Amino acid sequence: HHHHSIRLPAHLRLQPIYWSRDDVAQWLKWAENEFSLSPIDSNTFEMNGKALLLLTKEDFRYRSPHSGDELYELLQHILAQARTVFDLYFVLDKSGSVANNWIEIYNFVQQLAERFVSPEMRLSFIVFSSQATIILPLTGDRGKISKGLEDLKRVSPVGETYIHEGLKLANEQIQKAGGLKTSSIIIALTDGKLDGLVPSYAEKEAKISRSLGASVYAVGVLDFEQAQLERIADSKEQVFPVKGGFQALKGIINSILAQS
Ligand SMILES: [Mg+2]
Ligand SMILES: [Mg+2]
Ligand SMILES: [Mg+2]
Ligand SMILES: [Mg+2]
Ligand SMILES: [Mg+2]
Ligand SMILES: [Mg+2]
Ligand SMILES: [Mg+2]
Ligand code: NA
Ligand code: NA
Ligand code: NA
Ligand code: NA
Ligand code: NA
């Protein structure tokens, strides 16, 4: 049948894997009113969206004898709703300077790759030093992404810090994917210590990214050059320190999700 009209509150339209425990509770309140259900206790599902998605339909029925089957099917319909394809490009400094920090860069990327696993996400991994290389071409195939992560872990840092070459490969793929028609995010991990005219080259390439519609983030490693990262990223609000650990990861995750 094609007579379903499920429109969630705007702030609940993100894929349920990103729902907080409070989001789950709000979804229940919305559903009770939308579907004229009997009262749903606010603690019926004391868990976040990742956990909600592990429950079976039987679990829903046990938790809500009056409404669990309907809520489960509602969730399935929400999961089937089309969401805009979102493309994340990681542009990673493998120069000699960040050699003793490669694992820190890799681990930040792995954490973000593990977060952005909803089916509308596609990831690409690029590394740069004296030359830039696409390690993982843009894809939503989680098997290829896992292989891309294994390849990233084996990188041996060496060479100059020619970040413009890495940004160029993100821009080339964004152009091939549709340019302004795409939803594209670049995440550059670097200390931002650029030599010669590389600052000019990098800022030019980043402005090209923005002319293609992309939003540019910079994650700083080591004693990174904050001002330089601010000129590459869209703004200081899109510059995060890799040293901020979970708080920096949460900050950048929320910022990216808020581009949807
Ligand atoms: Mg509504
Ligand atoms: Mg909104
Ligand atoms: Mg929340
Ligand atoms: Mg029953
Ligand atoms: Mg460097
Ligand atoms: Mg510099
Ligand atoms: Mg999160
Ligand atoms: Na319906
Ligand atoms: Na790969
Ligand atoms: Na793209
Ligand atoms: Na965008
Ligand atoms: Na600027």
From Swiss-Prot:
Tissue distribution: Expressed in prostate, thymus, ovary, testis, pancreas, colon, heart, kidney, lung, liver, peripheral blood leukocytes, placenta, skeletal muscle, small intestine and spleen.
Pathological condition linked to this protein in its record: Hyaline fibromatosis syndrome: An autosomal recessive syndrome characterized by abnormal growth of hyalinized fibrous tissue usually affecting subcutaneous regions on the scalp, ears, neck, face, hands, and feet. The lesions appear as pearly papules or fleshy nodules. Additional features include gingival hypertrophy, progressive joint contractures resulting in severe limitation of mobility, osteopenia, and osteoporosis. Disease severity is variable. Some individuals manifest symptoms in infancy and have additional visceral or systemic involvement.
Entry similarity comment: Belongs to the ATR family.
Chain ranges on the Extracellular side, renumbered to this chain: 86-260
Binding site for a divalent metal cation: S95, S97, T161
Species in which this protein is naturally found: Homo sapiens (Human)
Domain VWFA intervals: 87-256
Modified residues annotated as Phosphothreonine in this record: T190
The protein, known as: Anthrax toxin receptor 2
Residues of the full protein shown: 43 to 217 of 489
Summary of subunit composition and partner proteins: Binds laminin, and possibly also collagen type IV. (Microbial infection) Interacts (via VWFA domain) with the protective antigen (PA) of B.anthracis.
Described function: Necessary for cellular interactions with laminin and the extracellular matrix.
